[PDB]
């Protein structure tokens, strides 16, 4: 019997355990810092292009088919010009990147920084700027690990406990600047960005710096934004708490049927063009510009994603419009992130939870009044629903509503739509989103050669 | 050679991602509902010994030197019947219970359901009604651990993934039912309880189902009560957030002295004791006498801890005051727990850092007149660095404290100090106490076999 052997073993890992080095605890905090700006130019870039877009349409506001034109090509061009930078420099940009960073987290799919930092940096800004639904999730968390990568590869300080350590500090601060929550940044990288079938070893307490000296750099530069600000909705009591079960499997069944939808509009919208640099440019520029155009024409469906949340949680939508702001939604959102454009995806979801919510709670007071509901609840319950049903990672969804709604009286809800989303969403047989894309685009590099 | 066969057995086992199966998936529930309803059942009753205790205090109040005869009587008594359970029926049952599940998890230190649960239960009832300063959920995690064990053995599920997860499904509600936190017990299994050096296929979904049918029963039986409820203290801007990191500091150099005091009075009661039971029982009548002693006269020495948070963070303590709990808190502590007594380090702990944050704060709102403080900001952020500084679990302290404050609007300070007390703990060269004293206890295991 070796579990003597195995026991005298661990009496002896067990004292040196939570001591990470010095270097590591110093490289992290750089590492942070030069992510933390990155974020906070790549958001004051994108601010900029969309104020430079929206002051032109009021200069030239006289005529419908000059207008309109001028709408449609000015967000064109931007979304041609970044579809054409990844699509020539470096084609592993295209898409969200949390698959790149949680493949570059297994030694698959090598992380660069070469021809990643500037060709993502202005792709993203490019394909953001002309208002197209895309979310600035994806375009940061690969500015984030690349970040780390590079201030490794300059100050070669080798071994393993550092390359997976400053690949996943930058990713988890590139989480945390991006939506000013510090938890959810660190949550990802704990349950969903490390490799979850061999044990690795990263730590924790190095994310937790970076995380901080990133929130820090964000909080220096843009000052009171609170980028939602609804605020003390009313308390869910335990008498209507079974409605949010029936709004968890209701979200379970509509999440794997946006998966095999996103699944199957990547094939289908690849064989339109074949693979050639050219079509592909033409069809981002013409996929860019519709957007752009219905960012102006009905600018509450295609464009950004939290514009809508405080004017449809706790308010007014006359469910014609909220049935419109669902369909246009989802077939925008379909289009401009299986197209192949450099964004995210995080933001189209919290966008598109809400509206489902909202919809039901709009339903919900009016069946059964005796309970004296509101319908602002539901839209927080349902924020952080499809964001796990579609992804798998329901602690990360309900910290992140935590995080920048501020409504703790609501956890019970918020935590049960949020599993019962998981709990039907894997009967019906779906798959997590992330952990799709990554094996089909290792599939597709392992059937070469 | 061999990165084609690890990508191909990555495709494989990472298309089928998050599929457990359903006999565990509904096992969770039961063993949810089942510690739910045995933590309330504890949480009432020590209560109720706690009201009882001190209305037979009030049937004789002329004669004082009897009144406080009878008051350390009828403590010691019910310290010596919780001493003498622990002592005969499971020497597992005493100190804290997170180091024996953090062993049961790592098959070391075998759960023995027939004879925990009913001497925890009616032992730590005994002595946290008998007014000892001890936590509430020490006796709670291993009951939930226990009882996770006693419902795979009485449904007889078969497999290594299912002894792994009832095991923590259970831990993580038992937590969760003792602070009324569904966000504490999970994101204390994650990074604390799980094993560390191996690879263990705890499932997510199973241990976050079971919080929340655990936090359902507490909210119906407990009605809302708020156990901690300071409100809506005041934020701290970006020019005074250098302060908290000299709190850090502190609190980092204060931590790795506490645990040496906490692992060498250990030793120095057992010299005393000489493992005789009656010595122990008499020995440990004498400390809950003395706790229920110092319960009526000074009431804030001794108590359960929760009881002076709401009234040290308003600044209306003198620094005199706060100095003496403080003193004659840290000796009553160390006195109650490490002597060998179920109950938990977490809530003493808990408000033994308040206490040392409000007396940092009553010194920074006098030296720094420019800044316009207020000391409650300090006392919120130091609440939870003696559980960073001491069981190195910073997210799980900073969530907890988040918890259990409902105040938000400062993260970065916590966040700050739960992290400078860590790296300045590291740096003086102390243990995480969970890793200590399972060190100490397969030590004291492999004696001579």
Same mark, same amino acid.
């Given at each position: 019997? *070796?579990?003597r052997?195995?026991?005298? =073993? ?9 001591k990470?080095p ?13 992510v933390? $700006? &990155? ?10 292009? =969309? ?6 349409? +009021? ?6 088919? $000059? ?6 090509? %000015? ?23 949390i ?8 030694? =698959? ?7 990643v ?20 999730? @994806? ?32 990713? &988890? ?10 938890? *959810?940044? /660190?949550?990802?990288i ?9 044990? #690795? ?11 901080i ?5 964000y ?20 008498? #209507?708490?079974?409605?949010?079960? /029936? ?12 998966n ?29 510009? $519709? %957007? ?8 509450a ?6 514009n ?11 469910? @014609? ?5 669902? !369909?246009?939604? +989802?077939?925008? #959102?379909?289009? %401009?992130?299986?197209? @192949?454009?450099?964004? @995210? ?13 909202? *919809?039901?709670?709009?339903? &919900? !007071? ?26 798998? *990672? ?6 992140? +509503? ?13 935590? /049960? ?30 059937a070469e =050669?």
């Amino acid at each position: 019997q *070796a579990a003597r052997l195995r026991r005298r =073993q661990l009496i002896r890992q067990l004292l040196e355990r939570d001591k990470t080095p010095l270097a590591i605890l110093f490289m992290a905090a750089v590492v942070g810092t030069l992510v933390g $700006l &990155a974020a906070v130019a790549f958001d004051k870039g994108v601010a900029w292009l =969309q104020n430079q877009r929206m002051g032109a349409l +009021v200069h030239t506001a006289d005529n419908y088919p $000059l207008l309109l034109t001028v709408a449609f090509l %000015c967000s064109a061009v931007l979304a041609m010009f970044g579809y054409f930078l990844v699509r020539k420099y470096a084609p592993e940009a295209g898409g969200s990147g949390i698959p790149e960073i949680e493949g570059a987290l297994e030694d =698959q799919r090598p992380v660069r920084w070469w021809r990643v930092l500037p060709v993502k940096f202005f792709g993203g800004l490019g394909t953001l700027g002309g208002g197209m639904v895309l979310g600035r999730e @994806g375009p940061t968390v690969q500015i984030g690990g690349n970040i780390g990568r590079m201030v490794l590869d300059i100050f070669r300080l080798k071994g393993d406990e550092a390359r997976h350590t400053l690949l996943a500090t930058g990713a &988890a601060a590139g989480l945390a600047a991006a939506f000013n929550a510090p938890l *959810a940044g /660190i949550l990802f990288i704990i349950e969903e960005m490390r490799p979850q079938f061999r044990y #690795t070893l990263i730590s924790i307490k190095a994310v937790f710096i970076g995380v901080i000296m990133s929130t820090i750099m964000y909080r220096i530069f843009n000052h009171e934004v609170a980028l939602i600000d609804v605020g003390k909705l009313s308390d869910a009591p335990l008498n #209507t708490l079974w409605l949010y079960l /029936i709004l968890g499997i209701i979200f379970g069944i509509f999440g794997p049927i946006f998966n095999k939808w996103v699944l199957g509009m990547q094939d289908l919208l690849h064989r339109v063009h074949g693979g050639n640099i050219t079509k592909w440019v033409l069809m981002g520029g013409a996929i860019g510009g $519709l %957007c752009g155009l219905l960012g102006f024409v009905a600018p509450a469906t295609s464009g950004g994603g939290f514009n809508l949340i405080p004017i449809a949680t706790a308010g007014n939508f006359s469910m @014609g419009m909220l049935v419109f702001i669902f !369909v246009a939604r +989802v077939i925008t #959102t379909l289009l %401009c992130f299986s197209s @192949g454009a450099p964004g @995210g995806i995080f933001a189209p979801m919290l966008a598109l939870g809400t509206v489902l919510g909202t *919809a039901f709670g709009m339903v &919900a !007071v009016e069946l059964f009044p005796q309970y004296h509901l509101e319908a602002g609840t539901f839209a927080i319950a349902g924020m952080g629903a499809l964001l796990a049903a579609s992804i798998r *990672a329901p602690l990360t969804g309900i910290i992140l +509503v935590l995080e920048m709604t501020d409504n703790y009286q609501l956890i019970l809800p918020m935590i /049960i739509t949020g599993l019962g989303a998981t709990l039907l969403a894997q009967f019906t047989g779906g798959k997590p989103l992330y952990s799709a894309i990554l094996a089909r685009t290792l599939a597709k590099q392992e059937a070469e =050669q």
